[PDB]
Amino acid sequence: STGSATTTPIDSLDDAYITPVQIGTPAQTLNLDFDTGSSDLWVFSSETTASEVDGQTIYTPSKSTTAKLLSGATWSISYGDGSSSSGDVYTDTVSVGGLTVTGQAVESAKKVSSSFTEDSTIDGLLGLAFSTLNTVSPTQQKTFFDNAKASLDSPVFTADLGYHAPGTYNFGFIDTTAYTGSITYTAVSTKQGFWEWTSTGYAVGSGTFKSTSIDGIADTGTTLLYLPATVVSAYWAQVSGAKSSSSVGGYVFPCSATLPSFTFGVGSARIVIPGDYIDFGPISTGSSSCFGGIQSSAGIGINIFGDVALKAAFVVFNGATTPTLGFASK
């Protein structure tokens, strides 16, 4: 089998992307944030504290003839941005772009933190990291991809995120019309549960490529590109007036600037992020200070190839027995 679904930016900055997902019988369609950095499929629901729902579409398990309470199971997750959610668990039928999994764990939120409430466009998350990170207790549950894998034509999914435009998540096949040149595959460590790989270096604008190993994760659920402070300083030093602002929480730059591109290495191949992809707009409405899309990872503990980097590429998440990642230009 295969599946193919369009993913759409939630706002004019590409802060996140939502993908429609069918849950239950009859189908209830919710718009989920596909997150290769986590491993829980959780939804706003009829069980979510009413004051914490503000415009999201909710899953109502009592209206699904295929929903079954997973008795005793609870979940609770905290994300790198400080947000969190928790609740109980149902199994139900879940379909993405025509690919159907029966018996998928659907984690129903009883509580969500303010950032989720305040984002009316995201109805939940669909985790695509490794199932070892799934938070359901006492019986850990599998991701949608893990449950689908055996049925797929090939044990892969691909992320093709757009810049200020829709893109595609495919399951079970590689669309050879969706990229240019060849796909370069690179090794993955699953020891931390992530799609963790090692970039071979970077360049800033038209500058020379610096060969240096940068370990990080391919994370569709993180907006920006988080890299070591040395790399990030070298980037912003090429933008007149750019500075790191403790009060804003990162590098800012004059909105009048033209940003240089940023290149990252995948083996001997190179992915070029155009400068415009690194502009996240005014820090507050009407400000002439703009927020940068490349930020230091020094306070995170891990480097994160988030959407800013991934949207410049066609990305293969290869879930074969030994997983690997593939990157192509597009």
83 is catalytic: no
Of 3, 227, 215, 25, which is closest to residue 126 (Cα–Cα)?
3
199 is catalytic: yes
Longest dimension (CA), the chain: 60
One domain for residues 229 and 156:
no
* β 225-227/294-296 pair status: parallel
Q: Residue 150: what residue type? A: A
Which listed residue (35, 119, 219, 279) is catalytic? Answer: 35
Residue with tokens 């930020």: 295
Q: Is 221 helix (H, G, I), strand (E, B) or coil?
A: coil
Alpha helices in the chain (DSSP H): 114-117, 144-148, 229-236, 307-310
One domain for residues 187 and 245:
yes
One domain for residues 186 and 163:
no
One domain for residues 118 and 132:
yes
Q: Which residues pair with 242 in a beta bridge?
A: none
One domain for residues 188 and 163:
no
Of 94, 88, 41, 87, which is closest to residue 64 (Cα–Cα)?
94
Experimentally, how was this structure solved?
A: X-ray
What are 305's two structure tokens? 């190839």
Domain count of the fold of the chain: 2
Asked which of 134, 156, 174 is the last residue of a domain, the reply is: 174
One domain for residues 84 and 24:
yes
One domain for residues 89 and 162:
yes
Which listed residue (38, 64, 131, 199) is catalytic? Answer: 199
Whichever domain contains 288, its CATH number is 2.40.70.10
Asked which of 174, 190, 207 is the last residue of a domain, the reply is: 174
User: φ and ψ at 224, to 5 degrees?
Assistant: -105, 175
Of 289, 277, 225, 221, which is closest to residue 13 (Cα–Cα)?
277
Which domain range does residue 248 map to?
A: 175-330
One domain for residues 260 and 324:
yes
One domain for residues 192 and 170:
no
Distance between terminal CA atoms of the chain?
Answer: 25
Q: How many CB atoms neighbour CB 206 within 10 A?
A: 9
One domain for residues 170 and 184:
no
Of 157, 203, 152, 148, which is closest to residue 178 (Cα–Cα)?
157
What are 72's two structure tokens? 């005793």
Q: This structure's resolution (angstroms)?
A: 1.1
User: φ and ψ at 66, to 5 degrees?
Assistant: -105, -5
Q: How many CB atoms neighbour CB 269 within 10 A?
A: 18
What are 145's two structure tokens? 């991809």
One domain for residues 244 and 318:
yes
One domain for residues 186 and 320:
yes
Name every residue whose Cβ is closer than 8 Å to that of residue 15 and which is 6 or more positions away in sequence: 9, 223
